[PDB]
């Protein structure tokens, strides 16, 4: 996944900043590029699958993880080792089939607050550490069924991925 699941983080943090009607990817300007590594397949639908479902379950656990991120109050010079401690615990409670979109919820709540602190430089660092963990402990264990592509199977049959072409009529 490497860069694909990293840009998955970037747009997911944008969706979190949308609480304010904002995106840090506006500053990055890469919403014009429209890259996001979607492969033009269905791996694009991953972010929307994790958006609808992940944020639905989140709401209760969102205020709960706001109380977690209240401890992880992002001050000038907060060591990411505090977050790494929460991510450590996260792995021990499970390999994170659903707790992995909750991993995006912790770092997402952090990135809302760190932009709110004008530590958007720490946001890009949080997206880096998240992407690191993703390709480090999660990536094989999830990639067996996509991890996130399971959510995609249930919400879309990749029927839209077939029709994504559309261009067969041009001949």
């Amino acid at each position: 996944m490497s860069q694909s699941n990293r840009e998955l983080v970037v747009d997911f943090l944008s969706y979190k900043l949308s609480q304010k009607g904002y995106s840090w990817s506006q500053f990055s300007d890469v919403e014009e590029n429209r890259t996001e590594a979607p492969e033009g397949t269905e791996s694009e639908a991953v972010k929307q699958a994790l958006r609808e479902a992940g944020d639905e379950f989140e709401l209760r656990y969102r205020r709960a993880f706001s109380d977690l991120t209240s401890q992880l109050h992002i001050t000038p010079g907060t060591a990411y080792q505090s977050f790494e401690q929460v991510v450590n615990e996260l792995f021990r409670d499970g390999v994170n089939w659903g707790r992995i979109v909750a991993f995006f919820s912790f770092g997402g709540a952090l990135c809302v607050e760190s932009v709110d602190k004008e530590m958007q430089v720490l946001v890009s660092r949080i997206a880096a550490w998240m992407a690191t963990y993703l390709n480090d402990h999660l990536e094989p264990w999830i990639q067996e069924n996509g991890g996130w592509d399971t959510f995609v199977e249930l919400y879309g049959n990749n029927a839209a991925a077939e029709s994504r072409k559309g261009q067969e009529r041009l001949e």
């Binding site: 609808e52 479902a53 639905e56 379950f57 409670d93 499970g94 089939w97 659903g98 959510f151 249930l154 919400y155």
Partner: peptide
């Protein structure tokens, strides 16, 4: 069964 996609998913996924 419910079959409500997300609601059912997270209901069973919540207590791991």
């Amino acid at each position: 069964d419910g079959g409500t996609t997300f609601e059912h998913l997270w209901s069973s996924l919540e207590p791991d």
